[PDB]
């Protein structure tokens, strides 16, 4: 049949289990405990726990009245001007009895895809019906929402998850799932995570399903991206011919696009610590120039070869 | 009506009338006698005779009255690759052949499929990896697309798979001289010796550029009203080419080696109005072709000239680039 | 009502200098049925725009010089207040592309479509060298398709950055800077038309050399000189210059006389003062470079290094957004090389 | 057809053929642990003191939202200048007195501006004049219903013609008259025209910018001196109002965080109260970092000129890279449907399109034509951005880069140029044709030559003042 | 019959998909286990993503395949609203079916926008139990990361030499053609892991032959039908640049460029590829050559005149290879 993915099987059902952004999570917990939910626009990078946070907040605020107190408007359902003018207005005008302090919930996930006119009609129905219902937004980009909506909401800028909270939650999941782990494998999972908690959970689940013991090489065998160790050796090789060989064989002939190679090289240079800060900045500038030349249209092998030549010159000289 | 541009007035209406290109014209007349051609490409110097060739092909394949109906011309223009090209092609495919004429019966094959001409459609904001694939697969028997390009730089092998690649070789001097002299004598253009070679050298074999330059020179001669033969200097002025005496003075100044003299000469010359790109090109022609310079000097000057030209193409100030280039040449 | 404005020629026969070009334009205006696309290039302030206006006046009539101002507002994907004041007339149109920046493809395409929607309406394009590659391609595509109601006449400082097909499909017209005798004649005509008491004609010659082949700068010099001394020019009156040029000269003096980091801080402050007064960075780089090249205490190799750095940073400026960074980099590079 | 004399041959000029060793990989955990990301000191999250709630206030344990909780009850608390309040109150009472008489007076407003209290002020005026909440009746028109002629024309005429069942202090209030839909709000301006002709109650329209309302309406408003413009309030007064609201709540707060909140919220009263409502709960957690501090700044002089020269070259290359990369996105972005697209305007021009399809896709009625380039689009947040990384790395150790990041702006140096050009126009007028010719002239030469010479003329005429009049404007604009 | 070989020689099952092995083994493990998550195939065109997934879907879906799959295309003339309506109608229906697990065949997702991808992933969220999604793309950098996190990410690499050679051996016996070893070597070198390219070259060579029964196909025929520069011509150009004078090197370069109609760019990458096989005494030679050639290519991409760029290429190569000497 089917197996429940660990991204959804171990999804936190309460606000306490959500890690990262401790101040905002604690304030949301206090709001749920007391009441009087404010209008907020949860903004930040995807996969950091915004939709789960707002859903848990709605759960803790309402309880049994979840079904009839929350109207969820996602990109799957139509969210045009007629939707805002009719169904949101009717839901605000709906007479639902709640304990004091609680209010009806109107969640508009991925609100960055909203049309301008729908947002313009949304501010008035949220200003007039603020005594009975409260709105909650969750968008990846906060600049796609017009200024009047931001003037009526407390914009939440959720930050990227650090390594400590992700690492401890992965330890908790491993302990509750009986997963054999090793330090290098966890470090590789965090390295590929980029703070994308969903990506980290998916990578750990795939590693467990495929290679059993979670080692660094096993994690890097399923990331289907250029290997950070191979890229690091390719950037830091004392011989230019070895670097050209590596990029030709393990990168160009393996189907890795130029954008992926440039991104991996930039990440490796940013992760570098042996070389000086000025030399690191020079390499990052060179990688930025290579990305410039690829964006102009020249994403050719020769551009990567020249970037490697100048990086090797920087390493050998100065 | 009153006037026709000579680039389009003297187009070869007959496929066999096309100058040279025997290996192309014979195969295309055999193909039209077979009454079927696939989606096929061309590659060669711009203005070598690609659009003229396809126009002659569809003239000897279709009827003159059917020109404005069966042929619907979508080149690299205001037409957008996925916006208005696709809908136009689709509603043209739904459209059928109009009434046949009297001369198109048993003389022209007039096959049911249409011919759609796309000139330089590779250089468009929309990448057509499979845009026309289903519209020439489902409508193969009622339409056909021909693509025109300059080089063999194929981007996507789909949409250009069944390709009959024919090559237009570079136009030789003799046939270009003969055709352009024929055009001039039909248009009673008065010119003396050495001129037509100057136009073909300026245009670098581009006959459309050569024809336009000849028309402009004839217009200038008629507007002057003297009636004398057109001289080469008017041709150089009409194309932006710096006169050779100035180039001789420039190379003498950079051979002198005096910095202040070079700066003063550049300052005086930017008041003449001649473009710096033409100066760089003529310096390249005078330096690389010459056999009186050492290998290292040419090796350095080629890179210097290339850097100066690339900087000039980026919309930068011409005086500073020209001064830097002349000084760097002097320091060599 | 400025002198450069009120003494601008308004007819083809009123043109004094470049008699051959005047006759050529007169003969083009002789036949109004055919006007090929013109690309006038040359140094600034030599009469290219004046010649185009005179040609348009001759071909259509007196209504060409009745210009009207239409304000067009546009918004890009970044929601920026892109405003363009399209200068219009009952016989032609004027568009400046560099006032928009990168969006000079979409805005030009929209303007051309709007104009062509309404024998032919001329579109005058100033500083055609500033057009981007996509904008130039769009212009070329407009030329062939819209060759019935739209005839593009472009005036540019330099014709080098233009693409090859535009050169192919245009009648290249060169407008050389007039010889100093012609500037002297024009200034003498202005003087005898407005009664400036000159003790000698050498002042007009000196203004002609000071204008380095620019008519508008010479006229503005005459204006400022006459309004300074109240119609009483003498020989002892010094050749004045705009304040930004003087501050640039002071900056080069400070650069050549001082070797310290605080000198670079002062240079950055002076560049901030210059840019805040709305002066383009290209001419600032030009004047700064060509005043650094005139310093007597420099040898050949240092001056070659200065011109090389100026060229490199001009390349960077033409592909950059913030001019202060590129100008500061050029200052720092010549500053380190000056040691 | 195809003939060539060239034959297959081998190149021997370089060194003999290179033997190619395979490069195997045997990475060990000792180098795997080097993948540990170095602690980025560029990010500088600073904490503030936790709020201490004093006492048990009834206002603290409230249910309504704080901007609604602190809604003004009189004309002193609504944060608006007093002259404008007195003028609008006088107009309202004069209109109510005049409209009682059977009726040259057309009650009309355009309450345009960038303030916040553009709606609550009218309600406070109604509370003041009526003396009770239920005495006055306001038909508040919003954007959440359809502002079409056939859906509201008769209702508005009935409201403005007959009495209200219960002094009938009736008023018609139009919020969000800046936003209009072409088909959803079709015939709206006809509704305003018809109401203005047949009116016996005041009509008030509030907006953000004056240009949306048609020019004849502007002329009618200006003839009766009913065109009221509101301006934003300085940060000092709104900060004082926030301090008064907090001391009314008996909550201790530090002044620096309140100043930062006021600065980042563009001095918006609703936004500030909303942020303080969210961020002043009874919790032990720290507060938002707001404005980030110095992330271990080492903005030294650079010692040798080589280091500062290399840094400036790096800044120039950074600027070039950013200018190239900030407007080139690999992911195509959607085009907003409710936006005045030229293609959408052209589509609506054709009369073949019926009503049902028109309601499906409409646009906001605007005086700006919204163009866009599908190929040239802004970068998405997840996309690679080297420019931002290098900028935050360099600004962490050099403050002057951060200063340069905001010393000059795109909006700046353009309004400054417009102001200088209009001052030059006034000076040249003070001695039409120049009005059109200089605008016809390229703006680059205006920046270059004519403006400094105009300054020279102005300062020469001002020197003898201590052929033209009023030269001080050109002097002060060039200053 | 008289059809293109692209659709004629599609793999009817998973066994005939050569080159890719890890993804096929993972698919076989999935079908043996029964778990079929959301899949995502991407990579260079012609690797066989569509062929692999159609083989999968047919071998799972038997005879009601024609009803219970639907093949979609994001680039067709439907629009975001129409594709959304189609997906909702195909997922929220539960028609007459023997076994469930509805499959989505959505090709060319690289042209999909951010809002469309968000809607797609939301539909994936809502209808996971009944419908499985296998959206297909080609570049992984043109897709929003939220869509990547909800599908089993499988990268596709270009086919190796052995699989291509095995498929050529399979094709030749069926089509009664034959290829010389040098011709096969050149073809697999120019293929660059593009299978459809190989099939089109084979069909073009068969059509080109006057008697396509016992006639041999050489390197010239494939190199002229495909439209690729010949290695011998580029080697001759390189040796003329190296061991010959300036004038004759320029003449040879211009003559080759006019005769074969190859761009200066493709000449530059060909020269780089040829020189990479050879070794250089000094490394600064290679550094300078790579940097100068990259700058020349970048300047060519913007535009200009070709003569000065060819002169720059010749001068840069000469200077680089005299630096080592
Ligand atoms: N801090 C966290 N602690 C625990 N689980 C988390 C955390 N952040 C994310 N997750 C989980 O990761 C997955 C991400 O789901 P979402 O919250 O919907 O992602 P998002 O942050 O809303 O961004 P989107 O959905 O891509 S716009 C869910 O399964 C969450 O439960
Ligand atoms: N063989 C020829 N005989 C006579 N005239 C020719 C010949 N080839 C080209 N021309 C002329 O050159 C003009 C342009 O050349 P073509 O290649 O046919 O058109 P084109 O393809 O549009 O040129 P480009 O590539 O766009 S610059 C034609 O209109 C003819 O007038
Ligand atoms: N001192 C104050 N004066 C005015 N409004 C205040 C004040 N303090 C808080 N507010 C709130 O500020 C808001 C202003 O009224 P709104 O109707 O929300 O906005 P608006 O007047 O329609 O103008 P907008 O939002 O820019 S279109 C109300 O919610 C008030 O409760
Ligand atoms: N591994 C393979 N084994 C056998 N045939 C293959 C293989 N890979 C591709 N092909 C064939 O090559 C052609 C490519 O067809 P498709 O698989 O549809 O292309 P694709 O790989 O999906 O890439 P596109 O451009 O996105 S359709 C078909 O004729 C396939 O049968
Ligand atoms: N033939 C001429 N005789 C006298 N003055 C001229 C002539 N041509 C141009 N000018 C002067 O040039 C000024 C306008 O220059 P303009 O054409 O705008 O320069 P540009 O073409 O570089 O923009 C006018 O004020 C006019 O006095
Ligand atoms: Mg979400
Ligand atoms: Mg053509
Ligand atoms: Mg496919």
Numbering used by the authors:
A (entry chain B): 6 to 323
B (entry chain D): 22 to 353
C (entry chain E): 2 to 119, 134 to 354
D (entry chain A): 176 to 278, 329 to 391, 398 to 662, 699 to 733, 769 to 781
E (entry chain C): 11 to 335
What did the publication describing this PDB structure actually write?
PCNA encircling duplex DNA is quite stable and is removed from DNA by the dedicated clamp unloader Elg1-RFC. The three alternative RFC-like complexes are formed by replacement of the large subunit, Rfc1 of RFC, with Rad24, Ctf18, or Elg1 (16). Specifically, Elg1 contains two external loops that block opening of the Elg1-RFC complex for DNA binding, and an “Elg1 plug” domain that fills the central DNA binding chamber, thereby reinforcing the exclusive PCNA unloading activity of Elg1-RFC. In all three Elg1-RFC structures, we found five bound nucleotides: four ATPγS in Rfc2, Rfc3, Rfc4, and Elg1, and one ADP in Rfc5 (top right).
